[PDB]
Amino acid sequence: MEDYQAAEETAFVVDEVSNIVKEAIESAIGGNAYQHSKVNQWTTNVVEQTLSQLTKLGKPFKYIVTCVIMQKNGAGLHTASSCFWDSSTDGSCTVRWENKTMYCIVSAFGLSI
Protein backbone atom coordinates (compact mmCIF):
# COMPACT_ATOMS: atom_id res chain seq x y z
CA MET A 1 0.00 0.00 0.00
CA GLU A 2 2.98 2.25 0.71
CA ASP A 3 5.20 1.76 -2.36
CA TYR A 4 2.41 2.68 -4.78
CA GLN A 5 1.92 6.15 -3.31
CA ALA A 6 5.72 6.31 -3.06
CA ALA A 7 5.68 5.79 -6.83
CA GLU A 8 3.05 8.53 -6.99
CA GLU A 9 5.34 10.87 -5.00
CA THR A 10 8.41 10.21 -7.20
CA ALA A 11 7.31 10.18 -10.87
CA PHE A 12 5.91 13.24 -12.64
CA VAL A 13 2.22 13.07 -11.82
CA VAL A 14 1.19 15.13 -14.83
CA ASP A 15 -2.18 16.68 -14.01
CA GLU A 16 -2.17 17.32 -10.27
CA VAL A 17 0.00 20.12 -11.64
CA SER A 18 -3.18 20.98 -13.62
CA ASN A 19 -5.03 21.24 -10.28
CA ILE A 20 -2.29 23.63 -9.13
CA VAL A 21 -2.67 25.54 -12.46
CA LYS A 22 -6.47 25.92 -12.07
CA GLU A 23 -6.12 26.99 -8.42
CA ALA A 24 -3.45 29.52 -9.49
CA ILE A 25 -5.60 30.85 -12.36
CA GLU A 26 -8.80 30.98 -10.28
CA SER A 27 -6.90 32.70 -7.45
CA ALA A 28 -5.20 35.25 -9.71
CA ILE A 29 -7.45 36.25 -12.60
CA GLY A 30 -10.93 35.25 -11.52
CA GLY A 31 -13.75 36.49 -13.72
CA ASN A 32 -12.22 39.91 -14.37
CA ALA A 33 -12.12 41.54 -17.79
CA TYR A 34 -9.10 42.51 -19.82
CA GLN A 35 -7.40 45.54 -18.39
CA HIS A 36 -3.75 45.49 -19.39
CA SER A 37 -2.31 46.95 -16.16
CA LYS A 38 -3.36 43.87 -14.17
CA VAL A 39 -2.13 41.32 -16.76
CA ASN A 40 1.46 41.46 -15.45
CA GLN A 41 0.12 40.84 -11.91
CA TRP A 42 -2.06 38.00 -13.24
CA THR A 43 0.79 36.26 -15.16
CA THR A 44 3.18 36.73 -12.20
CA ASN A 45 0.55 35.47 -9.73
CA VAL A 46 -0.30 32.32 -11.79
CA VAL A 47 3.43 31.52 -12.19
CA GLU A 48 4.27 32.26 -8.51
CA GLN A 49 1.27 30.29 -7.18
CA THR A 50 2.10 27.36 -9.48
CA LEU A 51 5.70 27.45 -8.19
CA SER A 52 4.27 27.78 -4.68
CA GLN A 53 2.27 24.54 -4.65
CA LEU A 54 4.59 22.48 -6.87
CA THR A 55 7.23 23.01 -4.16
CA LYS A 56 4.87 21.71 -1.46
CA LEU A 57 4.37 18.37 -3.21
CA GLY A 58 7.77 17.26 -1.92
CA LYS A 59 8.77 15.72 -5.26
CA PRO A 60 12.44 15.95 -6.42
CA PHE A 61 11.95 17.86 -9.67
CA LYS A 62 13.07 20.95 -11.49
CA TYR A 63 9.93 22.86 -12.43
CA ILE A 64 9.41 25.25 -15.35
CA VAL A 65 6.15 27.25 -15.42
CA THR A 66 5.28 29.36 -18.49
CA CYS A 67 2.06 31.34 -18.94
CA VAL A 68 0.61 33.15 -21.97
CA ILE A 69 -2.39 35.42 -21.42
CA MET A 70 -4.22 36.84 -24.46
CA GLN A 71 -6.77 39.60 -25.12
CA LYS A 72 -9.84 38.54 -27.11
CA ASN A 73 -9.76 41.10 -29.94
CA GLY A 74 -9.95 38.69 -32.89
CA ALA A 75 -6.34 37.66 -32.60
CA GLY A 76 -6.07 33.90 -32.33
CA LEU A 77 -3.79 31.97 -30.07
CA HIS A 78 -1.18 29.37 -30.98
CA THR A 79 1.71 28.09 -28.83
CA ALA A 80 3.96 25.01 -29.01
CA SER A 81 6.40 23.14 -26.78
CA SER A 82 8.57 20.16 -27.58
CA CYS A 83 11.41 19.47 -25.19
CA PHE A 84 14.35 17.21 -24.39
CA TRP A 85 14.12 15.14 -21.19
CA ASP A 86 14.29 11.53 -20.01
CA SER A 87 10.92 10.13 -21.07
CA SER A 88 10.13 7.62 -18.30
CA THR A 89 10.51 10.20 -15.51
CA ASP A 90 9.47 13.55 -16.95
CA GLY A 91 6.41 14.96 -18.72
CA SER A 92 4.46 18.06 -19.64
CA CYS A 93 1.27 19.71 -18.45
CA THR A 94 -0.43 22.30 -20.68
CA VAL A 95 -3.84 23.77 -19.83
CA ARG A 96 -5.84 26.11 -22.08
CA TRP A 97 -8.35 28.52 -20.51
CA GLU A 98 -10.65 31.34 -21.60
CA ASN A 99 -13.57 33.54 -20.59
CA LYS A 100 -15.62 36.13 -22.50
CA THR A 101 -12.75 38.63 -22.57
CA MET A 102 -9.41 36.82 -22.13
CA TYR A 103 -7.49 33.75 -23.24
CA CYS A 104 -4.94 31.79 -21.20
CA ILE A 105 -2.45 28.98 -21.82
CA VAL A 106 -0.27 27.76 -18.95
CA SER A 107 2.40 25.18 -19.83
CA ALA A 108 4.08 23.49 -16.85
CA PHE A 109 6.95 21.01 -16.64
CA GLY A 110 8.83 18.81 -14.19
CA LEU A 111 12.42 17.65 -14.71
CA SER A 112 13.95 15.02 -12.47
CA ILE A 113 17.25 15.34 -10.62
Binding site: Y4, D15, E16, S18, N19, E98
Partner: protein, 49 residues
Amino acid sequence: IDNIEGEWGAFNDIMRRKDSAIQQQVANLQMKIVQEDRAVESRTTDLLT
Protein backbone atom coordinates in the same frame (compact mmCIF):
# COMPACT_ATOMS: atom_id res chain seq x y z
CA ILE B 1 -26.74 33.53 -22.47
CA ASP B 2 -23.74 35.42 -21.11
CA ASN B 3 -24.38 33.40 -17.93
CA ILE B 4 -25.34 30.13 -19.68
CA GLU B 5 -22.47 30.41 -22.17
CA GLY B 6 -20.09 31.24 -19.31
CA GLU B 7 -21.35 28.32 -17.19
CA TRP B 8 -21.25 26.03 -20.24
CA GLY B 9 -17.72 27.11 -21.19
CA ALA B 10 -16.76 26.71 -17.53
CA PHE B 11 -18.43 23.27 -17.64
CA ASN B 12 -16.44 22.40 -20.78
CA ASP B 13 -13.11 23.73 -19.38
CA ILE B 14 -13.58 22.15 -15.93
CA MET B 15 -14.88 18.94 -17.62
CA ARG B 16 -11.78 18.79 -19.82
CA ARG B 17 -9.37 19.38 -16.93
CA LYS B 18 -11.16 16.62 -15.00
CA ASP B 19 -10.73 14.52 -18.17
CA SER B 20 -7.00 15.32 -17.96
CA ALA B 21 -7.03 14.50 -14.24
CA ILE B 22 -8.70 11.19 -15.15
CA GLN B 23 -5.96 10.66 -17.78
CA GLN B 24 -3.42 11.21 -15.01
CA GLN B 25 -5.26 9.10 -12.42
CA VAL B 26 -5.73 5.98 -14.61
CA ALA B 27 -2.12 5.06 -13.67
CA ASN B 28 -2.58 5.59 -9.89
CA LEU B 29 -5.93 3.90 -9.82
CA GLN B 30 -4.69 1.22 -12.27
CA MET B 31 -2.28 0.03 -9.60
CA LYS B 32 -5.21 0.44 -7.21
CA ILE B 33 -7.15 -1.89 -9.62
CA VAL B 34 -4.18 -4.26 -9.08
CA GLN B 35 -4.24 -3.65 -5.27
CA GLU B 36 -7.99 -4.16 -4.86
CA ASP B 37 -7.87 -7.07 -7.36
CA ARG B 38 -5.45 -9.21 -5.36
CA ALA B 39 -7.12 -7.95 -2.16
CA VAL B 40 -10.47 -9.33 -3.42
CA GLU B 41 -8.62 -12.48 -4.61
CA SER B 42 -6.90 -13.06 -1.22
CA ARG B 43 -10.07 -12.31 0.77
CA THR B 44 -12.00 -14.45 -1.76
CA THR B 45 -9.72 -17.45 -1.10
CA ASP B 46 -9.87 -16.81 2.68
CA LEU B 47 -13.66 -16.57 2.78
CA LEU B 48 -14.11 -19.59 0.45
CA THR B 49 -11.91 -21.63 2.82
